[PDB]
Structures are given as structure tokens and as C-alpha cells.
Amino acid sequence: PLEEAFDWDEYPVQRVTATGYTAGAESTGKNPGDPLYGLTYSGVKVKRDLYSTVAADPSVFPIGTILFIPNYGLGVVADTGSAIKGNRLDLYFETVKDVYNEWGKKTLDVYVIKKGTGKITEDELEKLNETKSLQVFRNQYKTV
Amino acid sequence: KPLEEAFDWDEYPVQRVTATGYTAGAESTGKNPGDPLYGLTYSGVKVKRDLYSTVAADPSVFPIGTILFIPNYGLGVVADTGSAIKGNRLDLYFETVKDVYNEWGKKTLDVYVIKKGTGKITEDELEKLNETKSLQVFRNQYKTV
Ligand SMILES: CC(=O)N[C@H]1[C@@H]2OC[C@@H](O2)[C@@H](O[C@@H]2O[C@H](CO)[C@@H](O)[C@H](O)[C@H]2NC(C)=O)[C@@H]1O
Ligand SMILES: CC(=O)N[C@H]1[C@@H]2OC[C@@H](O2)[C@@H](O[C@@H]2O[C@H](CO)[C@@H](O)[C@H](O)[C@H]2NC(C)=O)[C@@H]1O
């Protein structure tokens, strides 16, 4: 594939943190019908292609900057965002499902603690969450 | 210390799986808020993010009620299922779509800077890049035919 087709290490390298996004309201607060729906900060339409539109911090990667992003592809800096600051990228995908599956999808090892019986109730789930020996870890997962 | 290193988890059996995130929202479930069935899992339990969170899996692999420890997510109780959740597949519940984007989808990686931009980009410039002759062989893997 493209990752192996060229010696990319001849180009400058930048460590970044990257998430995915779509043109939809969950990312942009805009919906179909809005005048600027689907349009990046630069004015060009969002695109997932050989060269895809990506979001970055203009002070780090100016608009028009061409990047190669492993496991995503070639990217042209065309968009920006309030949360997109510093060494941060946001990668355009067509659908929320694509963000979940093409960037969010992770292969990893999980530990099987107890085989289930086929049932679970609210009471049992509450009992598990009230486990005394684990309350010290609980604030790390509770939102409230 | 983090839960991920507070116990010798390798004492327990290990299962390689492919995992994604989901929410109660319509993008995942097709249900809208106001629906009395909104946020209701297959097991009849309400979706929950907590010490023990509700996760989705294939019952034939992980029966309902199965407790897992998923690194960088937490302890999970299999309480949900899904048409696409088959085989060694897990779907991890998050409260919002942004949480799925940020808390699961966020990756630290190196990218290569091919060319620094001038501060402007046009549709025609982007089109010409995508029409690069020597790269049309690679284009099938990114374009959605
Ligand atoms: C919270 C946050 O930073 N959201 C970003 C996320 O990353 C890129 C994209 O989605 C971004 O949306 C773009 O915001 C810019 C600044 O308000 C707008 O000028 C762009 O038109 C908008 N892009 C699109 C495709 O709508 C969000 O602001
Ligand atoms: C595409 C797909 O499989 N989506 C899944 C995704 O993973 C778990 C959850 O979201 C799942 O939603 C649950 O579907 C089950 C039937 O398949 C229903 O019985 C559950 O009530 C439903 N869960 C919720 C919280 O609505 C989606 O079907």
C-alpha cells in the first residue's frame, strides 16, 4: 500500500494527536440546508479521497499544507476548529459510522473476568458499581 | 495508580478483540431521545458509563452478564448486542459522540510534512492533486466508489 510505496522518512516528521470528524452537526453544529454545510474553513468542500481535507492549527500547519497520515492517507490542510490547537489534527470522514469504524476501531487484548449467565439486572449492575474495594478507582470513570 | 496497573490482569484469560465505541443516540441505535426505549440495552438494562460500564458483544462469545476488563476503557459488563457486533467484536458505550471521538478515537502518531501551505487552497488545486497520474493506482483505497 501507500505506507510502504515510498520512503516517507525523507520528509520532515511531526508528532500529533489525531481524531476524526464529519461535516455533520455533531462536529460542526451545522446541518444539510445551511449555507456553509460541508464547507471547510478554507472554503473548499470536505473530501475523502486520495487527497482528503483535514483540520489543523494554521500556526502549526498553514492552510494548503500537504501531509501524509499513516492509516488515513494523504491530507491537505483545509479546515480549522476551536479545539484544533497545537500539534493536533482532525481527519475528515464521510459518516459518523466511518469515524467509529475506520479510525476508532482498535484491535486489543481484553481480560475475561467472569462468564455471564445470560442475564443482567439494574440491581446487579448497581451492586457491581458499589464494590467497596474499587470505589477508590470509581472517580476515574464517573462523569459526574 | 491507574486500574490498568493496579492488579495482575494477566492472571485472567485474555481474548483479542476489535473494539469501537457507541452511544444511545440515533447514529448507533436508530433511536431518538423521547423514545421510551431510548438508552435501553438488549438485556433490559439502561446504558451506563461508570466503574462497571455497559458494553455490547456477541452473546455466543461473551454471554450477557460477562465481566471484562478493557484497557483504557475500564471494567465492562456485557449487557447489549448488535447486528454488526459478531465474532470477537466489542462495542463500548460512551455518553456522547464526542466522547467516542476523543476518549477512544484519539491517537498519538507521527505524520509526514510533504509541503507547507501558503495559507490558501482552492477546489481546482485539490482536484489536480487527486488527479495525480502516478498515484491513481492508490486512489481506489481512499475514494468511495
Ligand atoms: C470542537 C471542534 O474543534 N470542532 C471542529 C471539528 O474539527 C474540524 C471541524 O469539526 C470543525 O468545523 C469547522 O469549523 C470551522 C470554524 O468554526 C468552520 O469555519 C468550518 O466551516 C467547519 N467545517 C465544516 C466542514 O463545517 C469544528 O469546529
Ligand atoms: C450497527 C450496530 O450493530 N449498531 C449497534 C451498536 O452497538 C451496540 C448498540 O449500538 C446497538 O443498539 C442495540 O441494538 C439491539 C439490537 O441489535 C437492541 O436490542 C438494543 O436495545 C440497542 N441498544 C440501545 C441502547 O438502544 C446497535 O444495534
Looking at the structure of chain A, the number of domains it has is 1
**A13 lies in some domain:** yes
Contact A119, B64 (CB under 8 A): yes
Classified as helix, coil or strand, B27 is helix
**A120 lies in some domain:** no
What is chain A's Cα-based Rg?
Answer: 21
Using the Cα atoms of residue A129, residue A130, residue A132 and residue A136 in order, give the sign of their dihedral: positive
Which residues of chain B from 115 to 144 reach within 8 Å of chain A, CB to CB? 115-123, 125-126, 129-130, 132, 135-136, 138-139, 141-144
CB contact under 8 A, B117 and A70: no
Distance of CA B135 to the CA centre of its chain: 30
The structure was resolved experimentally with X-ray
CA atoms within a 13 Å half-sphere pointing along the CA-CB vector of A17: 11
Instruction: Give the burial string for A62-96 (b: 16+ CB within 10 Å, else e).
Output: bbbbbbbbeebbbbbbbbbeeebeeebbbbbbbeb
**B129 lies in some domain:** no
C-alpha span between B117 and B126 (Å, rounded): 12
**B137 lies in some domain:** no
Classified as helix, coil or strand, A84 is coil
Q: What residue has cell string 436508530?
A: B30
Q: Which long-range contacts (CB under 8 A, 24 or more apart) does A124-127 make?
A: A124/B65, A125/B45, A125/B48, A125/B52, A125/B54, A125/B77, A125/B79
Stated as kind and residue range, the H or E segment containing A25 is helix A25-28
Write the DSSP string, A32-66.
Answer: BTBTTTTB-TTSPBP--SSEEEEEE-TTTS-TT-E
**Rounded to a whole number, what is the distance in Å from the CA of A135 to chain B's nearest CA?**
8
Contact B48, A99 (CB under 8 A): no
Closest-CA residue of chain B to A90: B106
**B103 lies in some domain:** yes
Bridge partners (DSSP) of residue B17 are: A108
Classified as helix, coil or strand, B16 is strand
**A32 lies in some domain:** yes
**B101 lies in some domain:** yes
Q: Which long-range contacts (CB under 8 A, 24 or more apart) does B7-16 make?
A: B9/A111, B9/B69, B10/A111, B12/A111, B12/A112, B12/A113, B12/B69, B13/A111, B13/A112, B14/A109, B14/A110, B14/A111, B14/A112, B15/A109, B15/A110, B15/A111, B15/A112, B15/B61, B15/B88, B16/A107, B16/A108, B16/A109, B16/B88
Contact B21, B104 (CB under 8 A): yes
Bridge partners (DSSP) of residue A55 are: A79, A90
CB contact under 8 A, B126 and A17: no
Contact A29, A44 (CB under 8 A): no
Distance of CA B30 from the midpoint of ligand 1 (Å)? 25
Domain range enclosing B50: 1-107
Locate the DSSP E strands across B23-120. 52-57, 67-70, 74-80, 89-93, 107-115
